[PDB]
Every structure is written in structure tokens, then in C-alpha cells.
Design a protein around this motif. Structure first.
Motif, PDB file in Angstrom:
ATOM      1  N   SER C 330       0.852  -1.216   0.000  1.00  0.00           N
ATOM      2  CA  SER C 330       0.000   0.000   0.000  1.00  0.00           C
ATOM      3  C   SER C 330       0.881   1.258   0.000  1.00  0.00           C
ATOM      4  O   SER C 330       0.426   2.293  -0.513  1.00  0.00           O
ATOM      5  N   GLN C 331       2.103   1.169   0.537  1.00  0.00           N
ATOM      6  CA  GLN C 331       3.086   2.287   0.566  1.00  0.00           C
ATOM      7  C   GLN C 331       3.592   2.582  -0.853  1.00  0.00           C
ATOM      8  O   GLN C 331       3.932   3.749  -1.113  1.00  0.00           O
ATOM      9  N   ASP C 332       3.649   1.573  -1.729  1.00  0.00           N
ATOM     10  CA  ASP C 332       4.051   1.734  -3.155  1.00  0.00           C
ATOM     11  C   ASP C 332       2.970   2.524  -3.904  1.00  0.00           C
ATOM     12  O   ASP C 332       3.334   3.252  -4.844  1.00  0.00           O
ATOM     13  N   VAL C 333       1.702   2.394  -3.501  1.00  0.00           N
ATOM     14  CA  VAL C 333       0.554   3.163  -4.071  1.00  0.00           C
ATOM     15  C   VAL C 333       0.670   4.629  -3.630  1.00  0.00           C
ATOM     16  O   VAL C 333       0.244   5.508  -4.406  1.00  0.00           O
ATOM     17  N   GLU C 334       1.221   4.883  -2.437  1.00  0.00           N
ATOM     18  CA  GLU C 334       1.455   6.253  -1.900  1.00  0.00           C
ATOM     19  C   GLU C 334       2.537   6.954  -2.733  1.00  0.00           C
ATOM     20  O   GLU C 334       2.392   8.167  -2.974  1.00  0.00           O
ATOM     21  N   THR C 335       3.573   6.217  -3.154  1.00  0.00           N
ATOM     22  CA  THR C 335       4.739   6.736  -3.924  1.00  0.00           C
ATOM     23  C   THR C 335       4.429   6.728  -5.427  1.00  0.00           C
ATOM     24  O   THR C 335       4.361   7.824  -6.019  1.00  0.00           O
ATOM     25  N   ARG C 336       4.250   5.534  -6.006  1.00  0.00           N
ATOM     26  CA  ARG C 336       4.255   5.285  -7.476  1.00  0.00           C
ATOM     27  C   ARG C 336       2.843   5.427  -8.060  1.00  0.00           C
ATOM     28  O   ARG C 336       2.721   5.389  -9.302  1.00  0.00           O
ATOM     29  N   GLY C 337       1.820   5.586  -7.212  1.00  0.00           N
ATOM     30  CA  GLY C 337       0.431   5.862  -7.631  1.00  0.00           C
ATOM     31  C   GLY C 337      -0.300   4.606  -8.076  1.00  0.00           C
ATOM     32  O   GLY C 337       0.246   3.501  -7.893  1.00  0.00           O
ATOM     33  N   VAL C 338      -1.485   4.776  -8.672  1.00  0.00           N
ATOM     34  CA  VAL C 338      -2.419   3.672  -9.054  1.00  0.00           C
ATOM     35  C   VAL C 338      -1.867   2.899 -10.262  1.00  0.00           C
ATOM     36  O   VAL C 338      -2.519   1.915 -10.666  1.00  0.00           O
ATOM     37  N   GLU C 339      -0.715   3.313 -10.806  1.00  0.00           N
ATOM     38  CA  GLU C 339      -0.021   2.662 -11.955  1.00  0.00           C
ATOM     39  C   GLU C 339       0.131   1.156 -11.700  1.00  0.00           C
ATOM     40  O   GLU C 339      -0.008   0.377 -12.665  1.00  0.00           O
ATOM     41  N   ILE C 340       0.402   0.767 -10.449  1.00  0.00           N
ATOM     42  CA  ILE C 340       0.731  -0.636 -10.044  1.00  0.00           C
ATOM     43  C   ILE C 340      -0.554  -1.443  -9.800  1.00  0.00           C
ATOM     44  O   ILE C 340      -0.430  -2.664  -9.578  1.00  0.00           O
ATOM     45  N   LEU C 341      -1.731  -0.804  -9.850  1.00  0.00           N
ATOM     46  CA  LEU C 341      -3.059  -1.462  -9.684  1.00  0.00           C
ATOM     47  C   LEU C 341      -3.654  -1.819 -11.054  1.00  0.00           C
ATOM     48  O   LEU C 341      -4.803  -2.304 -11.085  1.00  0.00           O
ATOM     49  N   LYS C 342      -2.911  -1.585 -12.143  1.00  0.00           N
ATOM     50  CA  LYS C 342      -3.335  -1.921 -13.529  1.00  0.00           C
ATOM     51  C   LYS C 342      -3.219  -3.437 -13.734  1.00  0.00           C
ATOM     52  O   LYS C 342      -2.309  -4.047 -13.138  1.00  0.00           O
ATOM     53  N   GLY C 343      -4.115  -4.008 -14.546  1.00  0.00           N
ATOM     54  CA  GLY C 343      -4.124  -5.438 -14.911  1.00  0.00           C
ATOM     55  C   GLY C 343      -4.711  -6.313 -13.814  1.00  0.00           C
ATOM     56  O   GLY C 343      -4.459  -7.536 -13.849  1.00  0.00           O
ATOM     57  N   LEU C 344      -5.471  -5.719 -12.886  1.00  0.00           N
ATOM     58  CA  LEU C 344      -6.135  -6.424 -11.756  1.00  0.00           C
ATOM     59  C   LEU C 344      -7.605  -6.669 -12.105  1.00  0.00           C
ATOM     60  O   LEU C 344      -8.285  -5.708 -12.519  1.00  0.00           O
ATOM     61  N   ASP C 345      -8.065  -7.911 -11.930  1.00  0.00           N
ATOM     62  CA  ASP C 345      -9.462  -8.347 -12.193  1.00  0.00           C
ATOM     63  C   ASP C 345     -10.323  -8.071 -10.951  1.00  0.00           C
ATOM     64  O   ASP C 345     -11.563  -8.110 -11.070  1.00  0.00           O
ATOM     65  N   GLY C 360      -2.392   4.877   0.984  1.00  0.00           N
ATOM     66  CA  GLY C 360      -2.278   4.012  -0.207  1.00  0.00           C
ATOM     67  C   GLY C 360      -3.515   3.148  -0.411  1.00  0.00           C
ATOM     68  O   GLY C 360      -3.904   2.943  -1.578  1.00  0.00           O
ATOM     69  N   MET C 361      -4.112   2.655   0.683  1.00  0.00           N
ATOM     70  CA  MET C 361      -5.322   1.788   0.674  1.00  0.00           C
ATOM     71  C   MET C 361      -6.559   2.625   0.331  1.00  0.00           C
ATOM     72  O   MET C 361      -7.429   2.114  -0.406  1.00  0.00           O
ATOM     73  N   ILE C 362      -6.643   3.850   0.858  1.00  0.00           N
ATOM     74  CA  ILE C 362      -7.741   4.820   0.559  1.00  0.00           C
ATOM     75  C   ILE C 362      -7.736   5.098  -0.949  1.00  0.00           C
ATOM     76  O   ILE C 362      -8.809   4.985  -1.568  1.00  0.00           O
ATOM     77  N   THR C 363      -6.564   5.421  -1.508  1.00  0.00           N
ATOM     78  CA  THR C 363      -6.326   5.623  -2.964  1.00  0.00           C
ATOM     79  C   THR C 363      -6.757   4.367  -3.734  1.00  0.00           C
ATOM     80  O   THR C 363      -7.391   4.514  -4.795  1.00  0.00           O
ATOM     81  N   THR C 364      -6.402   3.184  -3.224  1.00  0.00           N
ATOM     82  CA  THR C 364      -6.713   1.861  -3.829  1.00  0.00           C
ATOM     83  C   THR C 364      -8.233   1.671  -3.885  1.00  0.00           C
ATOM     84  O   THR C 364      -8.723   1.226  -4.936  1.00  0.00           O
TER      85      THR C 364
END
Ligand SMILES: Nc1ccn([C@@H]2O[C@H](COP(=O)(O)OP(=O)(O)OP(=O)(O)O)[C@@H](O)[C@@H]2F)c(=O)n1
Ligand SMILES: Nc1ccn([C@@H]2O[C@H](COP(=O)(O)OP(=O)(O)OP(=O)(O)O)[C@@H](O)[C@@H]2F)c(=O)n1
Ligand SMILES: Nc1ccn([C@@H]2O[C@H](COP(=O)(O)OP(=O)(O)OP(=O)(O)O)[C@@H](O)[C@@H]2F)c(=O)n1
Ligand code: NA
Ligand code: NA
Ligand code: NA
Lengths: 534, 534, 534
Positions: C330-345, C360-364
Motif C-alpha cells: 500500500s506504501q508503493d501506491v502512496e509513492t508510485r500511484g495507481v499505476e501498479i493497480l493496472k491489470g487487476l481483475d 495508499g489503501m484509501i487511494t486503492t
């Protein structure tokens, strides 16, 4: 200066590569200019491996002085330039045999003869006998700490450490640090319990060599240090390497030799591992690839041909060729024919005893001779070469060795005392260790060895029958080498062949990764040359 | 200067006299001008011995600061002049209690709390707390090496040795060397096996103190040295001596302190054991003999009265009286009567709790009073002396303590909060450790202590009822000492008697063999005077 | 019928999968109609894992009765239908806490409280309490044989075996049998040494379960039997299987249950493992594949989310979907953004504590809501879903939990006692275990659970602020479930979304591979539906 001892023990499991680890450390110390030796203490009751089956124990190594020893002394001679002798290997059997003999004739003066001090004193004497006059003596203790068989050795070296003093003695302990898939972590628990076992017999290890499939991280090494009363810098990681020639470098990079030289107060230069860096380079960068078939009867255990497999690989290093060794059962050549020898760039028939699979080896030497496939015969590999030739070229039907068929018409190979001709007429000893051999001036062998007189090592009884020799010579076969007053045939060659050499001696015992070996250099070259004529 | 630690462990059996051996070593080091302390690590789960009955591991020793401790601290205070406190004794219970409290409130910050490192860290912290600021700290590990209960202590001290370094830490191990009648030989095997057990936990002993019923000969000491990786001069013999005051000399005569000061690099003068030589001399040269009857409820275990028995011996030293102590069950006085108190030169009633055997002690106090037999009452021995005088002189029928009979008409002894008179009228907590006591001008004790105020140690909650005191005072009983603003009665005397004294405090806890004790010196003197008069 | 006890111990290393092996054995015995239970004895000092962070020994499992336990009880509940309670898990800490409490108040009546018998008695009492009333009780001893922390447990169970008798007690010992590449052989030495260690503590194993990365051949099993005093058929092989659901079959195919029922004299039918065969079949025959992103703060140790990961696999079984779980920090979502949540079903946000990684979880949760990606929030995953909707839909600037920002204007999540509104106006405790939850009529979860009331398990103190709820409800958020008289919000839904659900409770603790879980079945179905639409 006082002789220093490094006692190398194994914990958790056997097959840690403790021989290669000890050899590698001796290599680093030798690379510092130190006078270093290694000895192997084997916990088996066999007085020596002379009687042992290759399929069970692996190859019988032969020293210059003619001792039959553990294959580990082969590792030692391939890593350091100190020559091994009888003094570098002894068994529980040797120790008990010596103590029993002394006891029965009355050398203990009616004393009760006990494991302590009589067996331990005999162990200590042979360790001092083999070690004294060296700077550093590595003493490899066979067996695993916790097993009954190694206890007298462990008690002996505990006593030596106290007597000689801890200024001139180190305990080095190899352990397994297994990686578990489930947790993704390496486990120090087996090392902790192995050190407790070693302590319970009165030995505090000074150095821990942790064997794992990958490097043991700093955190786990710190945990091991804390639990084992060992400083962090004396906890060495030795991962599974793709090449054993890297091990000297990996140990140096972790300061193992620095720690040892500090502990023993040795002021010696930094280790020059340039010859090993060269060996590592050569092995990693082969220009060609060859398939060499090793056709023998002990292929059930590759360690039966340890030094031969290594001597081939050293031939690959000198020619920058990757040797793929195909181990072929000689009995499969009898059953399924020369079909299974197809797609080989060269053929090697190594040493052996007993008739089982020998007719397959004879067939193999024929197939190699007739199809111009490079051939190297060692001891039995020469016997089957001389038989093949005499039987199929010189037309001596059923020509054999007296070892296999005692009362055959044409015993081309037999004991000196059994020497007879085809009619049964006669004329008018085991050969072990280094013997001077005289090479013939025009021979392929005298070119490769680049010298008149070579020293190679024998372990054989059955010789080329001189009384049947001239008849084989006239049929085309050339005698490339001979030795002694009896003019015993050491090397044979087949001209009208690219590369065909067979020798009585075991050249694989003089082959090293650094200095290579003339015969195997030539043999692997010829295998390369043959592979690129297809 | 870095603080040095001597870890004292026991093997083979308990009851090796480990506390007295540690104390004796401390006494030698004290006699060299070294700042020495001792601490006891007890493997029991009790947070302290406060709850424990004296028929278990013996008397509850009380320190100045009011800590209830192992009686070993009694041995420590009788051998060195360093005062023991709570820092000098802790249990497994104390460590677990502290770690569980810290864990539950969240001090370990979500960590898994493990024996290692959390329990072992807590142990090391308490050893460092009790030790640092001294030159040499003796750390006595309770229990026997090989037992589960001691393993956390042993692991803790192993880690300390490594952290602090082996220049400032020694391991001293006591073992049993049994004498076998069958072979007329002394046996080293238990010592060998105990050292292996200690090594298996990761501890190499540096010194071995061998306990036997006779001196351990040089050959057996050399055998122990050989098998235990211990220098020959570090193998110390300690026979069962007729007097524990000889032990410091015996350890010195074998160079134990010399070895310790060498290992710790301490430049300090040779030990002057003149004070111990003097005590030995006094003890060996009595002029007269007395039989002092000790009438209690714990006589089944003499160590229930360890400090009292020792205090009587010290009184003997100061008067050159050989004291024969007869332990008499107070319950036997309840059954068989005062018949068993015949032939006594003096009577001591020591401390205790519970009504069982108290009526026997009241009878005993009466017998001592009426037949003018010297009497010392300690805590309960004072209660029963007050009860005796209340019933049989002040004519208070069934006068008792509320501890035994809660609702008696005359509670002459009771909690301050329970204090009432004969008609049940009232006025408008545990005492532990050193409390000042004011002595009365014309009192026996005022002339024995030769000071107006004394410091003595308490362990009791049941006080003299001040509401019934004035009635007992008019009947002839003298208050010899009081303490605090509550003017609580500390000492009473029967002045129509040669020597009748009883105190609330435990004078036996400040009595040493070197400095004696005024009260006990007087009691044994009075017993000598009484013996002469018969 | 006398209750039978199987004591399960581990040697050589931890991470042998001892819990799953014990659970699998329990599953075979369950499938024979036997009344079976399992309990875990954990050697840690924590009174329970309530204080422990999930990056240590993994997730805190919660039982129906609200006990915080080792995650091993999760394995137990997923393999047998017996419900775990506080009786099924206890620590050294719990035992010491109980014995110290009893000792301090005086329950041991002046006795010395020792590891033996007082600690061992307390352990045996808790084993008998948790076990009696069952046919077979599996008792899993945490830690590794040879370690200090487990010795009290091992001594306790040794005494139990003797007391109860060997007709009703078996010792089952798990060991590592490593594969060495060098020799291409499997090593029995660690098993030999582990059994000796267990014997040295006084325990003869009756059954050996040998863990290796492949089947242990018959010759090595025969060697183990020979050295370990164990019958050959009681030496069981357990390779590292691709699926833990195969383990019951593998143990049955080697006669483990047959041997156990023979030793315990149990007449019960052959095990019907049809339910496990079915799960294996389902798992091996997926039709489609989905990638579900698990976004949390503990991803560094996957076992932090053991039950959640398993629950997702069970959802896969019930839909024949192969679930690829991507652990995302969730800390990677704080830094690198929602980019890493791509390709998720689908996206799952599991439970947790502390502000670290929450933004990061709120953003998620926002990303999942706005891009209509299926979302399951558990406890913290619900908090961050409520926070997301409060900020970005109900327009409450910096809406947060009091756990993270105590004094924020919109504490949409807070303790019931902290409940306030935007202006600071108020109204005029830990939730643990099974609580009834009322489901709302027109809700997604009402149709998944197909019941008006459900029982799920809680572990949280921070509730949905009912004072700010009415504002978030008007903005479109649906309350899907409430519980108690305080009408606390248990489940929320975003109804303008294919599948967006978040609950306070931990549904993962009631999910089994055999009976699945309605909520997770629906979540993985929604993920499959989403995957198809791309
Ligand atoms: N003489 C010993 C040594 C250790 N212990 C205990 O050990 C436990 C950790 O349990 P682990 O399975 O993780 O073992 P660990 O030490 O980490 O080595 P490893 O994982 O690398 O194999 C820990 O509570 C404690 F240290 C012990 O009790 N007595
Ligand atoms: N680790 C050891 C130590 C010793 N031994 C053996 O022990 C035997 C003497 O057996 P003893 O009963 O006489 O024992 P000893 O050592 O004299 O001590 P002690 O109790 O008699 O004083 C002797 O053959 C041998 F030394 C042993 O096997 N392994
Ligand atoms: N208590 C014991 C047990 C064994 N021994 C010895 O052990 C040696 C074999 O040494 P190994 O490394 O090959 O060990 P092994 O038993 O095969 O198990 P494994 O790990 O290889 O599967 C063998 O001479 C002898 F059996 C022993 O001395 N005392
Ligand atoms: Na671990
Ligand atoms: Na003896
Ligand atoms: Na083997």
C-alpha cells in the motif's frame, strides 16, 4: 616456527564437499607462500581402500609412494602442489590394526589397552608424523559429528589442541544451512545443534563453514555467531557453486585465510589466486563442445571414475572445450551392440578388475579403432585395446587376459609368472605408485609428453605378455612406452588412426586443473578435431 | 576498570555447599582489598521466598532493604562485609513476572517474546545491575547443570561471557568426586559427565572445584584437567572440612585467587586471612561447653534455623564456649511435657508462623522463666514469652495472638488494625528489613548493644498489643526496646531472672563469625554462667 | 472409552508444515467417524498473540469465543469441522502467568514452585481440559526438539504418556530429510540426530513423518526405522506437494491412520476422503483465471494474510477460477500511484492497524470504485472504503479514523466513546469473536449469504461513526449490515458498482476449502465476470 593444525569436521550431513573445502583453503594458504599439507582421517575399519569396491566407496586414489587412499587425496593434489603419501591418509582399521599388533607382542607391558589413551595416542602420533615440518596442516575428520565412528578421532584432536595449545590449533566445522521453500528462509537450527554436539565431545569450533544452496545472509551468520560462541567474521558462507575452482576465491573474499594467519601469527603476503582466476575463466568460456563416451563397468557410481572425469575436464580447460562425459555401461554394449556408441566424438575405457563387462569394452576398442574415433585406454582400457587388436588384426582368436580366461590359447595379458606362448612354452607382483616409463622416439605419446622419460602411477597386476608381443607388433600395433629391466609394455598406439593411445598407468592421478595433463590435453583436442569433420 | 564476573555452577548433585564455596572465594578476594559482591540466581518460579515455608529450601533471609531472599545471602553476609540487597537475589519467577508484565502492556512492540533473547536479556540486565561498580562479581547459578530449570540462567551467562569477553569472565564449576569403598578409589567420571553437560549448553568451565569427603589426589586432578579442557592448577580440591571457616585458606593454598587475579589482570596484594585464622583458632580452643535447647516447629529441617544456629556458634566464639545445639520439637513439649527441657544450660525459641506447636513454646518460655534458665525469644519466641507472662503472672486467662485465636479476650499480640482491650474497646501491614529500635536506659540489652539506638531486621505483621501492655508492665514485665511513632514493642525482659530477653526482630541476620553479635554473645555467656552454677 | 493423545513434535528445523500435517491427520481420523480435536502448544512468552504484530509469526487467528490464537488454528478449522476455542491454543506465557498468579496469592501452600512439577502439571491440566471428551486429541508442540523453549512442553507430555499409558498415547515426530545435489541422495542423519535429541529428553517417537522435497525411498525409511527404534511401517514420507489438500490421501496411502487406530484399539471404518478428492479435483480443473490484487501493509510476510489468501483460493474452488494473488504494498501506491493497480481483475484490502500505508489503501479503494474494479475490504479495508467515499463522494475534506488522526473534523471511523460530529457535538472496547450481524433486505451480501442474520468473527475497537453516517448514506453509500443494540455498521456497499463490499468482521476465519464462503465465492465470481468484460 611451530607447526599449526586446522582440524576440519563435518556436521548435520555427509556430502558437504568437506574435502574440496579443505583443499580450497589449503590452496589459498599455498597461494600465500605457506608450506601446507592436508591429511584425511577415515572412520572405516578397512585397513586401507585397497580391498574396497569402486561401486561402493568410489575410486582408489594411488599416491607416488604407492599407497591406496581415499579419493579425497585426489582433491588435495588437484588443489595444492605438496605430494600426498601414506602419511596423508589413515583409517580406524589402520589404528586398531597397529594397536592390536603392539598389544599381542607385548609393547604395552601388560597395561589395559583402552580407546583412551591408546587408540587416541596412536591417532595423535600419525597426525604429528604426517604434519610436522609444515607451517599449516589441514586434518580432515571423516564421518559426521554425532556419529560413533568419528568419536576417537574427535577425542584425539581435542587432546592435541590442549597439548599443542590454541595458539597453534583451530577447529573448523562445516554444517548444512538448508533453505526452506515454504518460509523462503535459510535455517541455522541444524548448525546450532551440530555445534552443541561438537561441544558435548569437548570441541569449541573457531570457524563455521555454512554450506547452503545460496549465500547465508549477514543476519543468519550473526545468529550462528551468537549461538555457537564464534565471532561473526569466523562464520563463512560457502554456497553451491557451478565450479569448485571458485571456492578458493569465495573463502578469500570472506577473509578466512586472514583470520587463520592472524590466529596462527603468520605474516605472509596476500593470496595470489591468479592461476585459479585463469582456471575459472577457461571453464566458463569454452569455444567448442564435445561428447566423450566413458565406457566402463562401475558407471553405477560416477565417483568410481572421479580422477578420470576430472582429468577429461582439465583437458577441456587447456583446449577451451566443454567436455560432455557420457557414462556408458560396457555390459549394455554386450546386450545392445555398438548402436549406443554412435554420436561420440571420442571414447575412453578407464581402469577396472573382473571379467564382467570386459567383452563390451573389447567391442568398444574395436568400434573406436575401425571408425577412427579417438580412443584413450587406461589400465583395463589398454588390456582390451591389446586384446581387440591381437584378436581382430593379428588374428589370435579368443585372445584374452589370464585374469578373465586363465587357460586361453593366446594370453596377450597375464601375470609375469604366468607368461606363456600359444604352445604353452615359458622363459628361463602388484605394481603400485610412481614408476619411470621410457617413451619411443616417433610415438604420438613422446610428442604430447614432450620428454623422453615420464613418471606415472600404477595400480595393476596383469601385464602385456612379452612372449606374444612381437606377433601383435608385426600385425601393425606400436609399443609407445616401456619401463624397468623386464621391459614391461606401459603404452601402446594404433597408427593408421587419428588418436589411439592406451597406457597401463593411471595418468588421471597426475592431472591438475592448473598444469593439465599432456595425454588428456591431446585426447580432448583429437575429440574436438574429430567433432568438426562431421 | 571493567567489572569481572565469576559464574559459579554446580554439577552431579545439589547440596555441594556451592554458596559457602562462593562466599569463601569472595572472602579471599575481599582479604586482597578487592571490591567484591555475590548474587544468587534461584531457578524456582516463586517471585521471592516470601510465600515459601521454611521446611522447603530453609529459612527466609531478610536484607536491610527488606527483601525476602534465599538463605545463601546469609552465607554471603557472614563471609564478606558487603551488605546484600534485592539486587543480590532473583528467581526465574521474578524474571518471567517482569517480562510478562512488560509484554502485556506492550513494551516489546509486537515482537514474539521468547526465552532467547527476552528472558536471557532480563537475566543479564539484573546480573549487570547487581554487579557493575564492583571489581569482581560472583554469580551463583542455583540448581544443577543438566536440569531444565537452570538452562535460561546458563544461556544468559554464556551470552554475557561472549559480550563482556573472556578477559573479564570466568566459569567456575563445582562437581562431586565420590569415594567408592569397594575399590578404595575416588571417581572422576561424574565430573567428566557434568563438564560435558555444561559444554553441551555452550559453557567451557575455566575452574573445577571438586567436592569429596577427602582431598582429591594429584593424579585424579590431572585426569579431570585432561578430559575437561581445564589447566591442572585450575582443578581445585575442596574436602568436607570440620569447619567452613577453613575453606578460604584451603582455596588460597591451592592458588584459586592467584589464578582468578591472573585471568582478570588484577594487581592486588596476597590475601591476609588473619581474621579467618582467628575465627578457626577461637572455634578450636573453647574453655567450657554448654547445651542450648532450640524449641521450634521446623526442627525436621535444621536449615529452617540456619542463621540462628550460626549466630549461637558466633556467640560461642566470642565467649570461647563450645555450643551443643539440641533441636527440640515444640509439639513434643505439648505431649511429653517439660521433661525433655531438662539438662539445658539455656533455651532459644526462634521465629515461626501458624498455631501448630505454639502452646509447646509458651510452656517452654514458662519453664525457662520459673526455673531461671537463660531464654532468648526471636519474633514468635517473643510472642510466646509475652503470652506466657500474660497468662501465668499478669493473670490473663487464655491470653493469645489473633494469628492463632482471632477472638480471644486478651489478644496480647495482634495486627495494629485488630488492637482491642479485654472488653473489646479500640483506639480512635508487614514490617520487613532494617528498622531503628530505641533501647531503654536500665535494660540488659542497652548494656549488651552499648548504644541507645540499634538497627535490626524485621519479618512479621503481628505486633505487641499496646492496649494490653500497661497491664503486663504492672505485673513485672519490662519493655527493653520500642521503635517508630507507634512506639511498637521490639524487646521485652523478665528482670527477676539472670538472662531472659525476647525481640520482634531477627538479630541472627546481622551476626557474623568475625564481628559476632552482642545479644547472642550475652545469651551464650549467660548459658555458660548457668552451666557453672549446676 | 479413554481419550487417546497424539503428541506431534518437530525436529531439525521449524517450517516443516507441522500444523498442516497434524490437521491432515485429524482430517483422515474425522473421515473415519472419530471425534477428533487438535491443540497448539506455543513456546513463546506472550500470554496470547493479541500484542504480536503480524510480520512476526503471521496473522492473529480469532476463534468463535473471541480468543486470539496462533494461525495454526486456522489450518485446524480448514481441515476438521470441530470449532477451535481458547482450550485449543496456549503459550508458555499463559502457563507461567497462571502459576505465578496462583503462587503469589498462596495456592501452592508454601511449596517451592518449580518447572517440574508445577509448570508441567499446569501444561498437562490444559492438555486434559482441551482434550478429554474426544476419541483422539492431536497435541502440536511448537518450536523444535533440542531448543530450550519447548523442554517444559516435552517434559509435560513425557509424564502424560507414562500416567495415561502407552495404549492411549503416541509420539509423532516430524523431521527434515534433505536432498543433496552433490551425491544425488537423501540424508537420514538429521532425523537420526533429532530422534536421539528427543530420546535424551525421555521421549521414544512411535511414528516419524519425514519431510523432503521428494518421496523418501524405502531403503532410507528402513535405515531411519533401524536407528530410531521405530517400526518400518511407522516411518511415513511426506514430500512437498503442489496442494496441501493431497496430504490426507498421502498419509492414508502409507497406513498412518491404520497404525494409529491399531495402537489405540479403535474399530472404525476405512477413511472416506471423497470431500478432499473433490477439493483436489476442483483445484486441478479450473475453467478460467483471474488476478486479484491484495493491497496491504504486511505483504513482506504473506502469512500475515494466511486465512485471506486461503479464502480467495476457496472462492476459486467454488467458481472453478484459478486465482493469481498479487501482494501489493500500500506504501508503493502512496509513492508510485495507481499505476501498479493496472491489470487487476479485482482488489482486496485486508485488515491492519497503524496509519503506515493507509493513505495508499484509501487511494486503492477510490481506484477500485471509480474504475468499477471488484472490491472486498476487510476491517481496515472497510475503514479505508468509508474514508474514500466520505472524502471523494460525500465531500468531507480529510475524513479519517481517530486511530490515525485523532482530532480530524470528520472522524468517520472512531471508538464509540470518541464519537463526535463535524462541529465536535457528541451523543448523550475491543470486539472479539463470533457476533450476529443483521443483513439489509436489498443488499448484495443478503443474496450471497441467503439469510437475514449471519455469525462472523471480529477483531477491532474502531467502529463506523454513526454521527457522520447519515451524511455518507445520503451521498449514495448503502449500509448492508448492522449488529447489536448500538446498531454498529458491519457491512457497506457502493451500489453504483458491479461488486463493491467491505465488512468490519474477518470472513476469512470461517472460510474452509470444503464448504467455501459465500462472500469470497461472490468476490471471485465478480472478478471472473470483470476479467471476461476486458
Ligand atoms: N538453544 C535455543 C535456541 C533457540 N531457541 C528458541 O528458537 C526460537 C526461534 O525458533 P526458529 O525455528 O525460528 O529457530 P531459529 O533460532 O530462528 O533458527 P532458524 O530459524 O534459522 O533455523 C526462539 O524462540 C528461541 F531462541 C531456544 O529456545 N533455545
Ligand atoms: N570420554 C571417555 C573417557 C574414558 N573412557 C574410557 O574409561 C575407561 C576407564 O573407566 P573408569 O571407570 O575407570 O573411568 P575413569 O576415566 O578412570 O574415571 P574414574 O571415575 O574411575 O575416576 C577407559 O578405558 C577409557 F578412558 C572412554 O571410553 N571415554
Ligand atoms: N550412530 C551412528 C550411526 C552411523 N554411524 C556411521 O555413519 C556412517 C555412514 O555415514 P553417512 O554420512 O553416510 O550417514 P548415514 O547413516 O548413511 O545416513 P545419511 O544421512 O547418509 O542418509 C557409517 O559408517 C556408520 F553407520 C555411526 O558411526 N554412528
Ligand atoms: Na526462523
Ligand atoms: Na579409574
Ligand atoms: Na549414506
Amino acid at each position: 616456527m611451530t607447526t599449526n593444525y586446522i582440524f576440519v569436521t563435518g556436521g548435520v550431513v555427509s556430502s558437504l564437499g568437506k574435502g574440496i573445502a579443505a583443499a580450497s583453503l589449503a590452496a589459498i594458504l599455498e597461494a600465500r607462500g605457506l608450506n601446507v599439507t592436508i591429511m584425511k582421517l577415515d572412520p572405516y575399519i578397512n585397513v586401507d581402500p585397497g580391498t574396497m569396491s569402486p561401486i561402493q566407496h568410489g575410486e582408489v586414489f594411488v599416491t607416488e609412494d604407492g599407497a591406496e587412499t581415499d579419493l579425497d587425496l585426489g582433491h588435495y593434489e588437484r588443489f595444492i602442489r605438496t605430494k600426498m603419501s601414506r602419511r596423508n591418509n589413515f583409517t580406524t582399521g589402520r589404528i586398531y590394526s597397529d594397536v592390536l599388533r603392539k598389544e599381542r607382542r607385548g609393547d604395552y607391558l601388560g597395561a589395559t589397552v583402552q580407546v583412551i589413551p591408546h587408540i587416541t595416542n596412536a591417532i595423535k602420533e600419525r597426525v604429528l608424523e604426517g604434519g610436522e615440518g609444515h607451517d599449516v596442516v589441514l586434518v580432515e575428520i571423516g564421518g559426521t559429528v554425532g556419529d560413533i565412528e568419528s568419536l576417537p578421532f574427535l577425542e584425539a584432536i581435542r587432546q592435541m589442541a590442549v597439548e599443542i595449545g590454541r595458539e597453534h590449533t583451530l577447529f573448523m566445522h562445516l554444517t548444512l544451512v538448508p533453505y526452506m521453500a515454504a518460509s523462503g528462509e535459510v535455517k541455522t537450527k541444524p548448525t546450532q545443534h551440530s555445534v552443541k554436539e561438537l561441544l558435548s565431545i569437548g570441541i569449541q569450533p573457531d570457524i563455521l563453514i555454512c554450506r547452503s544452496d545460496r549465500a547465508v545472509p549477514a543476519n543468519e551468520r550473526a545468529k550462528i555467531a551468537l549461538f555457537c560462541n564464534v565471532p561473526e567474521k569466523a562464520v563463512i558462507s560457502l554456497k553451491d557453486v557451478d565450479s569448485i575452482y571458485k571456492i578458493p576465491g569465495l573463502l578469500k573474499s570472506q577473509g578466512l585465510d586472514d583470520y587463520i594467519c592472524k590466529r596462527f601469527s603468520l605474516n605472509c603476503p596476500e593470496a595470489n589466486l591468479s592461476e585459479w582466476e585463469q582456471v575459472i575463466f577457461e571453464e566458463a568460456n569454452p569455444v567448442s563442445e564435445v561428447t566423450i563416451g566413458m565406457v566402463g563397468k562401475y558407471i553405477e557410481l560416477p565417483d568410481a571414475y572421479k580422477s578420470v572425469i576430472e582429468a577429461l575436464k582439465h583437458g577441456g580447460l587447456k583446449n577451451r572445450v566443454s567436455v560432455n562425459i557420457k557414462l556408458i555401461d560396457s555390459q549394455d554394449v554386450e546386450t545392445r551392440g555398438v548402436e549406443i556408441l554412435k554420436g561420440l566424438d571420442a571414447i575412453l575405457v578407464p581402469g577396472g578388475f573382473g571379467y564382467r563387462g570386459v567383452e563390451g569394452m573389447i567391442t568398444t576398442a574395436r568400434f573406436a579403432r575401425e571408425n577412427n574415433i579417438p580412443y584413450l585406454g587406461i589400465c583395463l582400457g589398454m588390456q582390451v585395446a591389446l586384446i581387440d587388436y591381437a584378436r581382430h588384426v593379428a588374428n589370435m582368436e579368443n585372445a584374452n587376459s589370464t585374469e578373465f580366461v586363465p587357460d586361453c590359447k593366446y594370453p596377450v595379458v597375464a601375470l609375469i609368472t604366468e607368461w606363456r606362448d600359444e604352445n604353452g612354452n615359458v622363459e628361463v607382483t602388484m605394481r603400485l605408485g610412481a614408476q619411470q616409463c621410457q617413451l619411443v622416439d616417433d610415438s604420438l605419446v613422446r610428442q604430447l609428453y614432450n620428454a623422453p622419460t615420464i613418471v606415472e602411477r600404477h595400480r595393476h597386476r596383469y601385464e602385456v605378455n612379452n612372449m606374444l608381443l612381437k606377433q601383435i607388433e608385426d600385425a601393425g600395433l606400436r609399443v609407445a612406452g616401456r619401463s624397468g629391466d623386464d621391459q614391461l609394455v606401459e603404452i601402446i598406439e594404433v597408427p593408421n588412426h587419428p588418436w589411439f593411445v592406451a597406457c597401463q598407468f593411471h595418468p588421471e592421478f597426475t592431472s591438475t586443473p592448473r598444469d593439465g595433463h599432456p595425454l588428456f590435453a591431446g585426447f580432448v583436442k583429437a575429440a574436438s578435431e574429430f567433432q568438426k569433420r562431421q
